[PDB]
Structure formats: C-alpha cells, structure tokens
Amino acid sequence: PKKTIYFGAGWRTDRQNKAYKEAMEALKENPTIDLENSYVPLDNQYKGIRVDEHPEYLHDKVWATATYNNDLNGIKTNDIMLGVYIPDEQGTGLGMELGYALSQGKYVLLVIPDEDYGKPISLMSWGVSDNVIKMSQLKDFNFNKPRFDFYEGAVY
Amino acid sequence: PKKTIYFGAGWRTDRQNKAYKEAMEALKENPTIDLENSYVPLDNQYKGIRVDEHPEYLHDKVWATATYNNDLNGIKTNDIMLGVYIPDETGLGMELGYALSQGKYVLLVIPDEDYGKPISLMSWGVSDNVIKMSQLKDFNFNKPRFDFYEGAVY
Amino acid sequence: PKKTIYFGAGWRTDRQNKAYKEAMEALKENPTIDLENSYVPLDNQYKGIRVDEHPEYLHDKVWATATYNNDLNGIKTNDIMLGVYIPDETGLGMELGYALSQGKYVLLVIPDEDYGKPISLMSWGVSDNVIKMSQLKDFNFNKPRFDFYEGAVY
Amino acid sequence: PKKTIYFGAGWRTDRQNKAYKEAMEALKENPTIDLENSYVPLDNQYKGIRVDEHPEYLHDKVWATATYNNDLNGIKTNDIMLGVYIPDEQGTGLGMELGYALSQGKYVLLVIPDEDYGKPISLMSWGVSDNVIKMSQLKDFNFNKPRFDFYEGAVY
Amino acid sequence: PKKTIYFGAGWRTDRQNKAYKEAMEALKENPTIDLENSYVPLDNQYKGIRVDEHPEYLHDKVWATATYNNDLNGIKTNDIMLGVYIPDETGLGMELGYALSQGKYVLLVIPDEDYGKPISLMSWGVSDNVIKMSQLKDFNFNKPRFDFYEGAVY
Amino acid sequence: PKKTIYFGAGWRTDRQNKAYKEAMEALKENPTIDLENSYVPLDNQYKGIRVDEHPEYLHDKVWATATYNNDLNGIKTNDIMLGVYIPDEQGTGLGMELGYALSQGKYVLLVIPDEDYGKPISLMSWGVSDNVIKMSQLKDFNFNKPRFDFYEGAVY
C-alpha cells in the first residue's frame, strides 16, 4: 500500500532549495509514497499563474484566497503531512500548515537535513510533530506504519 | 463585556521585545480585555522556569511536554488568540493554526511602522483580522469581525 | 447569565420576514440574551453593503469571500446558534452544520402557526432543541438542554 | 487509485430525479470513483424500511435517529462529499450534509446540471464547496487530484 | 470570574457516592464556579427519569438517545469538564475524550485517600490537570493550567 | 479493498485475554482487514520496553507521554476503531480511545463476546459506537461498507 503527502517545503533560500530537492528525491525512491497523487504546491499554482514574473497578483485578494484554499485543501485531502524544517531559518512558513494538518488528523512528519539534525527546533514544532527524522531516513521511511518519537535535540 | 486572550508574541529579537511591550500596554488600556485572567506564555513556563534564563531545560522533555501542553491549554481555554506579527523577521503559525482549529477569533497585530509590509499567505489566510499596534488599545473584543489586511501577501 | 447568539434567519420571502421580526423582538425581551453583542448577518455584510440593495455584488468574489468568513466568525465567536426555521419553504443547513462542528448549542425556532409540521431529517438531527416562536422570549439560554421536536420528520 | 463518495442528492422533484440519474451515470463511467463501496442513501435505508409506503415511521424517533446517524456515518467514512445542487430549488436538504463533510475534512464537490450552471447559488454553498463543476465534467473529474476553484456565477 | 462545569461522576458504588457528595460540596464553596448554571447529569436525565429508579428505561432507545445527547450538550455548552476519578475501581473516558475534542479544560479530581495511586495511561494523558478532592473548593477555575499527576501510570 | 484498524483491547484479565485472541483471529480471517498495517498496541511498545518486567517506567513521564501519543497516533492514522468490550468488567480503558476515535471521524465498532452479548453496556459506549456486533460476526464483517445500528440489549 502507498500514501500521498502534502509537500510542506519552501523554495525561497539556498538551503531551502537544497533541502527541497533532497526531499523530492527521497520520496521518488520510497515505495510507500504515491508521489503522483501527492500535493506539491508549486505544481498547483492557481490558474498556472507564476507569482515571481507576475507579482501584481500578490495584491489580489482573490488570488490569495484561491492559493490559500488550495494549499489547505492539499493538506486535508492527503494522508500525511511532510514538513521540511530548516532549524537555522527557524522553519518559517510551515507553522500554520503543520497546525492545520494536526487539526485534520494527519500524521505530521518533520524532516531535517542531516547537516542540521540536532540543532534547536521550536517548542511548537517539536510539540506538533508526530516524529522528526533526518533527510537520509526519509527514503526508507515506512508511511504505512508511521509511529511517534521525540526529536533527539534541543527545543527552544 | 470582558474577553480573555492568549498572548502570542515572541521575546528574542529587539523588534520582538518592543512589539511585546507595546501590545501588553495596549491590552491593559482596553476595557474589553480581562488581562488578569488571560494566558501570557512567559508567566506559564513549566515550573515557572524560563528556558532563556535556564537553558539547562533545552534538553528536558518533561519540561517541553508540560510547556507545550500549557500553551495549548492557554489557547483553548481563552476567548481570543492574539498574534504579534513582525513581518520583516517565531513558532506563531502553529499557535495561530491551533487557535483556528479551536474556534477562536484570530487577531494579528502588526507594529505601525511595519503595517503595509507583505505578510505570509498563510498568516493572511488564517487570520480573521489584521490591525495596527496603535489600534489594539481600542479594539472592541466583544464585537470581533472579519476584515482583510490592507497590504499584500508573499 | 447573558449569552450571545448568531441570528440565522433569511429575509427573502414574506414568511421569512415575518419570522425574522418576531424572533428579533423575542430576543430583545429575553434577559438571558445579550443582543448588542450578538452577530446579526444583515448588519455584518462586507463593507456594510447588502446584496439585495446592491446586486452589483452578486459577482464580486472579495465580497463573497469576506461575507462568508464574517458569518463563520459570527457563529464561532458566539455562544448559541439560532435557526429561524420555516418548514413549508435558506442556506441554513450549512450554518447549522458549522455551529454543530464548532460545539455550539443549536436551537431551531419555528413560527407557532407552523410548529407541528414536518421538518427535514437533517434539521431534526442537527438541532439540540426545537421551540415555538412564542417561547423564544422566555427560553433560558443559560441552561440550554436537549429535547426532541414534537412533530414528524420527512 | 479510486475513491468513495457520499451521494448527496435528493429524489423528491422532477429536476432532482433527472440530476440524480445523470450524476449516478457520471460516476459509473469515472474510473477514479469506486461506486460499489460508496454510500448512496437510498441503498441504505434503515432495516430496508421504505418511508414512502410506510410513512408511519416518520413519527418514529428511533427510525429518525438511525437514518440520520447512517447518513452522517456515510459522509464520515467515505473520501469525498458529492452535492447535486439544483439552483432553482435553492439546493434544499444538503446544507447540513455539506456542512458536516466540511467538518470531517472531506473534499466537498458541488455538481450542477449544465442547464442551470451559472445561476445564483447561496453564499454558504459557494463558501463551503471546494469546487463547483458542471454535470458533464463529473465523468472526467479526477478525484485522485481534487483541487480548489470558484463557481463561475452569481452568489446570493 | 465564574465558570460553569460538567459534573462527570458516577453514583453506583459506595466510593463513587462518597466522592460525588464531597465534590459537589466543594463546588458549592468555590466562588469561581457557577453551579446553578452547570450541568449535573443526574438532574438532566431524559424526562427527569433516572434509570436506577425506573429500570424500565434500560430498554428504551428514545430515552438513551435523548440522555446521551443531553450529556454531550452538557459538556459542549459548559466551560470546564470535571471528572471524579476513583482509581481502584464508569463511562468517564468517553466523557473525558469528548471534552478534549470540544476544547474544554479537563480536570480530574481524586479523593485524598486515593491520590497517589496509579491512574490509567489514557486518564493521565487526556487530563490537563489532576487534583485532590480537598483542593477542589479552592481551585481557581478562571486561571486553569496544565500540570502532571503526582503519581504513576498503569 | 482493505482497511486498517486500531486494536482497542485490554490484556489484563482472563476474560479480556480470551476476547483478545478471539478478535485477533477474527481479523486474520476477514478479507477486508489489512491486519499487517493495523495498529496493535502491544506490538508498538515505546522503544521495545516491557512495562511488566520494567515497571520503573510507570513513574517515567517521558515514557507515559510517548506511549499515550503512540496509541492516539495509532487511532488517528488508521481507518476504523475496534473496541473489544467486556460488559462485566464494564469495558474499562477504551472509553478515552473510543472518544478520541469519534473525534477523529472514525467508524467506531464495538465487538462483544457472544457469551456476554445482550448484557448491559454503558450509555456513553452505546452512544459513541456506530455499531455493536457479536465476536463471531467480526470475521464476516465488511469494513468496506460499515453501517450504523443499535445494540440489541440494555443500556445503563
């Protein structure tokens, strides 16, 4: 059996982009993930509109509403929530997404790159996650038998 | 005629501390807020012990379990959720998300000198309303309503 | 000793308007209802603009987004959900359903001249209690309880 | 992969019945719906009791409780919520069902017959739905990748 | 400054009855509890009829449907959920679980002579706080907080 | 299609143990249960720690937190909630679990051993369950089409 995820991961900084690629690749290799039917936000831009070359839409309340609703709906309609957390950039963005997944009854799984695993994560991130793994365990993670654990590191 | 709040605000950066003081002072002046009976996270850290003062507790799971639970309980047992949002720079998203799931009015307060700046799409969407810090003292928390942030999203 | 409500009632048909006036007048007389601080949808339409008065806004998504959110926020931030139910004839089911999910007491009020008539199975099942309009002025909203509608279902 | 739905659709008026048949047929043809394991209310009458030739049961609080609980349980235990909405008959009945599906974290999908698509829907229906499609798009709808959109028409 | 509760306590065993009386008397003395407007299950049995007094109703589904719904409505429309827990010996777990899902502060009260004894893991985990019976009269229900039971789990 | 359950069942008394075995066996034989990917608590002890030969951990708040969170997470991440209810031992333990499953939108199914079926169950158990069956119907129970019914017996 397989499972679909919401790809909670930012694409705005060097280290976010590096973590993104690594997590994408992690999931292609994992036989318990159905990546084709997962929700990856960048593949699901509203009406194909690219905010980077069309930033006028950042002032458009309809676009904002559509995008927001689509991401939520992406969390709500998939099995597992995936949070690529960058401890140094204090995991900024996915807080709300992680919180919404918890409210919808999803397994919330934080993945941290190995270079950063062990660094201090926020109390709320530690508390909201059902498990926190290294990037390199993500490929061999069994999403059919997801269990609870604590992060082995500091919590600020 | 008096609502209680959860004081969702950080205390690490200079900006954070300055917004923290302004908002707390605002809440004291608001006759529709009952601050004595509100939850302020700094005063409710497990065993009355602040991580920043005793970093010992960075690696203590009883402390982190207890403090996390105390903060959730502070959101759920109070009427309104307040988020002091500094757009240029938290842990706030999960607090905001938890409030939303618990049926609370979610109010973001942004310092006057930052109001207008782009806030994150999820912050924008999870909030019921978004105000300036100089408005917090007069906000009627007995008639809380939806409104859109006067600013863009990123 | 004072609860606030969400005033779930339509204002299109003659019957709807008549039940609307009767119920509002009842709520004014009820000393356990705090009507000043209750949410009445007609007074909280986005930009203070009523669709029926300015149908322009039928095709405005900002307006519909904002007004929908305002009504949800009116249900979730108030104590009780009130549904003025006209059995012979809304949008009320979703309001009722949202209240149920938010943990609110769901009270249906049916005009005396219609009380006894069949209500829909889902209306029947989602409601915590079902009363006559002439009872609304004296209902104790501080001790709200479950009871079955004295009537059939369809 | 396939998905199960709750068949939110009334059977009481001419145009409801016509929309019912069209939606049933839509789903048999859609390869992403598992219609055998979906919940269709009329197939799930309590103890096989036909209210039309046995209306005495409309005064029976036990029957009412059973039926109500079964429909909810039908929404709760399937993947997607399906609402056949008749704009002219102001979609009366499914409001509560749509609201309950939203509370259980389901994709809520309104289908309107093409003859009526574009006519004014209620604010709450517009707001509660994750998408609103024409009857003829229902057969080719991909329930494995359900996304958000707005209704292209009036909202009253 | 006054919160209402749901009085989650059994009345079958001797111990249950003794804890029932102690807790009710405690709640009367607590100036932060509004007991008149609280839900006490024994006083809200369907048709004012107690199963133990009229076991006739053991086999009545209208009665069981109505009483179950009334108890859920008593949890959801009140501020705090109270569980009188007798560790040596309910139906209480589902009441506790329902409160948790409804966003209520969950307080367990254990008789002084039993406090220290092992409570079930799920009781331990679902509760926001766990106190002695002799503390109930002075508990500040306006500032309810998380704390760990001073005792083991089984 | 198959479904995963949470095995809500105690292992502390003679009659609980007998009911446990019977329910385990019931599920191996049921083709609509995927028992390999279900959550059975005893197979999911935190860090393999056996409380019976290591009861020091009963005073360990971290172990308690881990275990509790794992069981919840077991309910939340499976399809159906299964409650092996012993009417005589007044079904003590699963109340919270049953309540949590109801809050997460799960079908809650009580199974009672045939010897005890008909005996008085608690109001809350009766009210929280979507159905109550005999142990011997559990093998032939179709979890792909779970429906509502009342318990045929006393409710105290």
Cα gap E96→F99, rounded to integer Å: 8
Contacts of D61 in chain E (CB under 8 A): 62, 65
- Which residues on adjacent β-strands are paired with residue D80? D5, D107
Contacts of A97 in chain B (CB under 8 A): 93, 97, 122
Cα gap B53→C129, rounded to integer Å: 53
The DSSP string of B91-113 is -HHHHHHHHHHTT-EEEEEE-TT
Q: In what order do the strands lie in the sheet with B5-8?
A: B5-8, B80-84, B105-110, B129-132
Helix intervals (H) in C84-131: 92-101, 121-126
Which chains does F contact via 3+ CB–CB distances below 8 A? A, B, D, E
Assigned token pair, D79: 């993947």
Classify each residue of F98-107 as buried b or exposed e, where b means 16 or more C-beta atoms within 10 Å of its C-beta.
bbbbbbbbbb
Domain at C82, CATH number: 3.40.50.450
User: In 10 A of CB E150, how many CB atoms?
Assistant: 10
Contacts of D72 in chain C (CB under 8 A): 125
3-state secondary structure of C51: coil
Distances (CA, A) of B16 to A90, B33, E46, E125, F129: 15, 22, 54, 34, 49
Cα gap F88→E125, rounded to integer Å: 25
Sequence-distant (≥ 6) Cβ neighbours of residue B50 within 8 angstroms = B42
Residues D55 and D75 sit within 8 Å (Cβ to Cβ): no
The answer to whether the CB atoms of F96 and E64 lie below 8 A apart is no
* Resolution of the model in angstroms: 2.7
The answer to whether the CB atoms of E96 and F100 lie below 8 A apart is no
Contacts of B146 in chain C (CB under 8 A): 66, 69-70, 73
Cα gap A85→A76, rounded to integer Å: 20
Residues D98 and D129 sit within 8 Å (Cβ to Cβ): yes
* C-alpha angle C57-C63-C69 in degrees, rounded to nearest 5: 140
3-state percent helix, strand, coil for chain E, nearest multiple of 5 = 40, 15, 40
Classify each residue of E116-136 as buried b or exposed e, where b means 16 or more C-beta atoms within 10 Å of its C-beta.
eebbbbbbbbbbbbbbebeeb
Domain that holds residue D150: 1-156
Contacts of E73 in chain C (CB under 8 A): 105, 128, 144-146
Chains A vs E: touching, with 3+ CB pairs under 8 Å?
no
Assigned token pair, D13: 């008026």
Please, is C154 exposed, middle or buried when counting C-beta atoms within 10 Å of its C-beta (0-12, 13-18, 19+)?
middle
The DSSP string of B16-59 is HHHHHHHHHHHHHH-TTB--TTSB-GGGGSGGG--TTT-GGGGG
Assigned token pair, A119: 């660094």
> Tokens 């003081």, residue?
B21
Q: In what order do the strands lie in the sheet with D107-112?
A: D5-8, D80-84, D107-112, D131-134
SS (H, E, C) chain D: CCECEEEECCCCCHHHHHHHHHHHHHHHHCCCECCCCCECHHHHCHHHCCCCCCHHHHHCHHHHHHHHHHHHHHHHCCCEEEEECCCCCCCCCHHHHHHHHHHCCCEEEEEECCCCCCCCECHHHHHHCCEEEEHHHCCCCCCCCCCCCCCCCCEC
Return the C-alpha torsion angle B111, B115, B120, B126, nearest 10. Answer: 80
Q: Is A116 left (phi over 0), alpha (psi -120 to 50) or beta?
A: alpha
In A, minimum Cα distance to F62 occurs at: A150
Q: Is B78 left (phi over 0), alpha (psi -120 to 50) or beta?
A: beta
Distances (CA, A) of C18 to C84, D105, E48, F96: 11, 37, 35, 47
Cα gap A68→A72, rounded to integer Å: 6
What is the number of domains present in chain A? 1
Classify each residue of F26-41 as buried b or exposed e, where b means 16 or more C-beta atoms within 10 Å of its C-beta.
bbeebebbbeebbbbb
Cα gap B1→E4, rounded to integer Å: 17
Which one is catalytic: A22, A97, A115, A152? A97
3-state secondary structure of F63: helix
Distances (CA, A) of A155 to A109, A123, B67, B139, F118: 16, 6, 11, 35, 52
Which chains does E contact via 3+ CB–CB distances below 8 A? B, C, D, F
Best interface-test mutation with A: which of C57, C59, C62 has the largest number of A CBs within 10 A? C62
> Tokens 């799971």, residue?
B61
Helical pair D94-103 and C92-101, crossing angle rounded to 10 deg: 30
Cα gap A101→A111, rounded to integer Å: 15
- Which residues on adjacent β-strands are paired with residue C33? C3
In total, chain E counts a number of residues equal to 154
Classify each residue of B111-123 as buried b or exposed e, where b means 16 or more C-beta atoms within 10 Å of its C-beta.
beebbeebbbbbb
In E, minimum Cα distance to F72 occurs at: E122
The closest CB to that of A124, out of B61, B94, B123, belongs to B94
Classify each residue of A21-46 as buried b or exposed e, where b means 16 or more C-beta atoms within 10 Å of its C-beta.
ebbeebbeebebbbeebbbbbeebeb
Chains A, B: CB contacts within 8 A come to: 103
Which of E50, F108, C7, E145 has its CA nearest to residue B47? Answer: E145
In total, chain B counts a number of residues equal to 154
Assigned token pair, A156: 């600020």
- Which residues on adjacent β-strands are paired with residue E154? none
Specify the experimental method: X-ray
Contacts of D60 in chain F (CB under 8 A): none
CA-based max dimension of chain A: 44
Cα gap B133→B34, rounded to integer Å: 18
Cα gap B58→B52, rounded to integer Å: 9
The answer to whether the CB atoms of C67 and D95 lie below 8 A apart is no
Chains B vs D: touching, with 3+ CB pairs under 8 Å?
no
Sequence-distant (≥ 6) Cβ neighbours of residue F116 within 8 angstroms = F86, F87, F88
Q: Is the dihedral of CA A39, A43, A47, A52 positive or negative?
A: positive
Helical pair C61-76 and C92-101, crossing angle rounded to 10 deg: 50
Per DSSP, F79 falls in state: S
B5 φ/ψ angles, rounded to the nearest 5 degrees: -125, 165
For residue E130, give how far its alpha carbon lies from the nearest alpha carbon of chain F (Å): 14
Cα gap D107→A1, rounded to integer Å: 22
- Which residues on adjacent β-strands are paired with residue B109? B84, B131
The DSSP string of chain A is --B-EEEE---SSHHHHHHHHHHHHHHHH-TTB--TTSB-GGGG-GGG--TTT-GGGGG-HHHHHHHHHHHHHHHHTSSEEEEE--TTTTT-SHHHHHHHHHHTTPEEEEEE-TTTTTS-B-HHHHHH-SEEEEGGGSTT--TTS------SS-B-
The answer to whether the CB atoms of F77 and A107 lie below 8 A apart is yes
Residues B149 and B39 sit within 8 Å (Cβ to Cβ): no
The closest CB to that of E77, out of C105, C147, C148, belongs to C105
Which one is catalytic: D25, D53, D97, D152? D97
Which of D156, D122, D155, D142 has its CA nearest to residue D33? Answer: D142
